[PDB]
C-alpha cells in the first residue's frame, strides 16, 4: 500500500487511529518510517488551540474524532494496516495550521 | 446585557452565538446579529464553520457554528445565556466570518 498524507489509519500504539502528516515524497520513498498525529475520540480536546475536530461522517471512522497535534508519533510503514479514509483538503489546512502553530514553523 | 461571544437560546428553541460587536450590543438597537449553532457535527466539514465541544459551550450536545447561517434577532428573543466561547475558538469563528463575508 502506498501511504499518502491526510489518510487515517488504525495503528497499534492499543489499536487507535492515526493521521498521516509525513509528506508524500517521503511516503513514496524507501524510508521505512512515517510521521503521524494521534486521533482521539475525546471531542473535548478540540478546544485545545491547534487541534482539529473531525466528524465521523467525514473520516469514515466509527465516532467523531479530534486530531491531537500535540501527540505526534513515528510509526513503521508496515504498522499502518487499515486505511480508513482521507481528510479533505479544507480540514487538512486546519491541521497544517495547527502543526505550524505547535512546532513554530 | 447581551455581549459578543455569548451563546443564548433563541425562540424558534435553538442556540445562537452573538457575533454583533459589543458597541452595537450595548446600544438601544433592537436587533443583535448572531450565527446559528447546530448540533449536526457533520457541518464542521464546511470550511468556515467552527466546532464547539459541549464541555466548552455548556450546551447539551456538541455544537458547530454555521458561519453561513447568520441571523438578526430582536434582543428580547434571547432568554437563556448558556455560556461564552473562548477567545481562541472565537478567533476561529472570526476567521470563518471574514472568509464567508470577504472581509
Amino acid at each position: 500500500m502506498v501511504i499518502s498524507r491526510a489518510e487515517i489509519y488504525w495503528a497499534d500504539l492499543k489499536r487507535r487511529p492515526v493521521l498521516v502528516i509525513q509528506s508524500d515524497p517521503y511516503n513514496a520513498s524507501r524510508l521505512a518510517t512515517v510521521i503521524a498525529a494521534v486521533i482521539t475520540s475525546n471531542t473535548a480536546l478540540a478546544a485545545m488551540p491547534g487541534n482539529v475536530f473531525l466528524p465521523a461522517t467525514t473520516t469514515r471512522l466509527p465516532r467523531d474524532s479530534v486530531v491531537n497535534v500535540t501527540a505526534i508519533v513515528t510509526l513503521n510503514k508496515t504498522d499502518l494496516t487499515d486505511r480508513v479514509g482521507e481528510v479533505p483538503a479544507s480540514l487538512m489546512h486546519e491541521v497544517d495550521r495547527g502543526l505550524r502553530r505547535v512546532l513554530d514553523l | 446585557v447581551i455581549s459578543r461571544a455569548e451563546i443564548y437560546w433563541a425562540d424558534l428553541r435553538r442556540p445562537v452565538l452573538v457575533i454583533q460587536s459589543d458597541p452595537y450590543n450595548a446600544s438601544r438597537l433592537a436587533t443583535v446579529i448572531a450565527a446559528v449553532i447546530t448540533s449536526n457535527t457533520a457541518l464542521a466539514a464546511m470550511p468556515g464553520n467552527v466546532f464547539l465541544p459541549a464541555t466548552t459551550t455548556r450546551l447539551p450536545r456538541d455544537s458547530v457554528v454555521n458561519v453561513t447561517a447568520i441571523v438578526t434577532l430582536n434582543k428580547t428573543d434571547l432568554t437563556d445565556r448558556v455560556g461564552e466561547v473562548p477567545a481562541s475558538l472565537m478567533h476561529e469563528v472570526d476567521r470563518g466570518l471574514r472568509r464567508v463575508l470577504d472581509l
Partner: peptide
C-alpha cells in the same frame, strides 16, 4: 468552490437550524 461543495455532499441532509435562519 469545490471545498464547500465537497462538504455539502458529505451532509446529504440539510440542517433545520439553517432553515430557521431564513425565518
Amino acid at each position: 468552490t469545490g471545498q464547500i461543495d465537497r462538504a455539502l455532499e458529505s451532509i446529504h441532509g440539510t440542517d433545520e437550524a439553517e432553515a430557521l435562519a431564513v425565518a
